[PDB]
Design a protein around this ligand. Structure first.
Ligand code: 6NU
Length: 160
């Protein structure tokens, strides 16, 4: 049971979820109704220029291991994973002048379209964490600089 989202083919490799229609608040205090997936799941994300392993719980990204052609491809996959995770810090990153969702249309696609234009606020607001040894995997900073000390929460970059 494969599906498509933001240019990526997702395939659930483990777990399951049930859905619940829920109301969430953006950074502009706008209410959006989203279909929340409850449960722990593991996916493969296959795109034309990046691939990834995503592990998520209800509105929480546990870990994302990304591989890709370059910084832009990888960032593109990171944006989709973050939006897909349904995390509240991703929702709270929708803010400021003109940044309102036009509310039958799917709000997940609307959130994606919003962050694809500029993921600067999404990437800042996400948070950063210290990393462990794990080699062949590097941390990535909000501005896409690689680091061996720190990375955005749960985000790891693997070599192609
Ligand atoms: C078109 C999307 C989504 C719409 C929906 O919820 O039915 N479609 C699917 N999501 C998930 C699915 C499974 N687990 C999920 N966790 C979060 C999440 F946003 C979606 C899922 N599984 C299968 C889907 F077809 C919007 C993101 C892809």
């Amino acid at each position: 049971s494969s599906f498509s989202f933001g240019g990526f083919t997702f395939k659930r490799t483990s777990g399951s979820s049930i859905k619940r229609e829920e109301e969430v608040l953006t950074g502009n205090l706008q209410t959006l109704k989203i279909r929340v997936h409850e449960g722990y799941e593991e996916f493969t994300m296959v795109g034309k220029r990046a691939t990834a392993i995503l592990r998520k719980a209800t509105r929480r990204l546990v870990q994302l291991i990304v591989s890709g052609k370059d910084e832009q491809s990888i960032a593109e996959a990171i944006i989709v994973a973050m939006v897909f995770s349904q995390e509240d810090c991703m929702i709270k990153a929708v803010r400021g002048d003109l940044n309102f969702v036009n509310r039958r249309l799917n709000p997940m696609h609307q959130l994606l379209r919003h962050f694809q234009k500029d993921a600067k606020v999404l990437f800042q607001n996400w948070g950063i964490e210290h990393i462990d040894n794990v080699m062949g995997m590097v941390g990535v900073l909000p501005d896409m600089t690689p680091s061996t000390e720190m990375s955005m929460r749960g985000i790891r970059v693997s070599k192609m």
